[PDB]
Design a protein around this nucleic acid. Structure first.
Length: 235
RNA sequence: GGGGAGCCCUAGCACAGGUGCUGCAUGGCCGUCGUCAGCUCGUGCCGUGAGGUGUUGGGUUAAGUCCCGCAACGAGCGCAACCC
């Protein structure tokens, strides 16, 4: 458990595409690959999961932002289990902020769903229908986990918050708690709460994330087990 | 026996008429870039602002048509389909 899980398959990163304040977190910098300090990282994880279980047991959406394919795939399934409205595919400008507009985009999609199994299965012209198939598909292709986000979200979990500081950027201006997770690449004070840990390792993703999801399922009282994992991680 | 209206004539009078000018006074019809693929709106973000964003990258199509990107996502008059 904990620190010894890391001595297994995950640790520090960076070809020196780093960030100075994160280097205060840092131990060493050999191989060219910074030597993460997973100890005080365990301290961080302590405070992190404190608020995790708190806000989760009280109830209010933490906003799975995984985007890089790897992460994304795993997290998506995990997200479905985590119960939290989630960012699956490529994060697009508008979600965080243009909230009402988003609710409208949903409405177009959801009502496409509603009127996809209607007498429209009979009627309606070909070009209209077929095109509407296409854009219905893509609409759900992006707004899957987002389709279930309807009232002031209260923290995010995210992954590597540089890209996912496109994401941070938004929720950061939005006076909102943002947990989020990365290597010595990103920035510490860029975030509200910090998980200093590599995220190009698919296993790392699996482990820390399942830890969090289980933390929120234990906020409500339980904890089962994940389906997505070691599978496509290595094969 | 006149007187009444309409209708025709003759000098008068208001009046008309113009394929006479000027499209540097114009409507309208259009010739015309040219079926060129463009023109623009909503919110968010951006810049002190003008304004930007959208539409700035890459294919692809008849085409701003569609698709991967992208601080954005749509909607609009055209494009298309809708009349033959």
């Amino acid at each position: 458990v904990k620190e010894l899980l890391e001595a297994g398959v995950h640790f520090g990163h960076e070809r020196k595409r780093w960030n100075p304040k994160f280097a205060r977190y840092i131990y060493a910098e050999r191989n060219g690959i910074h030597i993460i300090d997973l100890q005080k990282t365990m301290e961080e994880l302590e405070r992190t999961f404190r608020f995790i279980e708190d806000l989760a047991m009280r109830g209010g959406t933490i906003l799975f932002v995984g985007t890089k394919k790897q992460a994304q795939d795993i997290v998506r399934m995990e997200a479905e289990r985590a119960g939290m409205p989630y960012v699956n595919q490529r994060w697009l400008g508008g979600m965080l902020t243009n909230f009402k507009t988003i609710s409208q985009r949903v409405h177009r999609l959801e009502e496409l769903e509603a009127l996809f199994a209607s007498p429209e299965i009979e009627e309606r012209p070909k070009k209209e229908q077929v095109r509407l198939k296409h854009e219905l598909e893509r609409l759900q292709k992006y707004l899957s986990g987002f389709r279930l986000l309807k009232r002031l979200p209260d923290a995010i979990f995210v992954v590597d918050p540089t890209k996912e500081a496109i994401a941070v950027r938004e929720a950061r201006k939005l006076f909102i708690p943002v947990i989020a997770l990365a290597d010595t690449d990103s920035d510490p004070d860029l975030v509200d709460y910090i998980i200093p840990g590599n995220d190009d390792a698919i296993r790392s993703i699996q482990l820390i994330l399942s830890r969090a999801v289980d933390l929120i399922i234990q906020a409500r009282g339980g904890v089962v087990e994940p389906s997505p994992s070691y599978a496509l991680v290595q094969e």
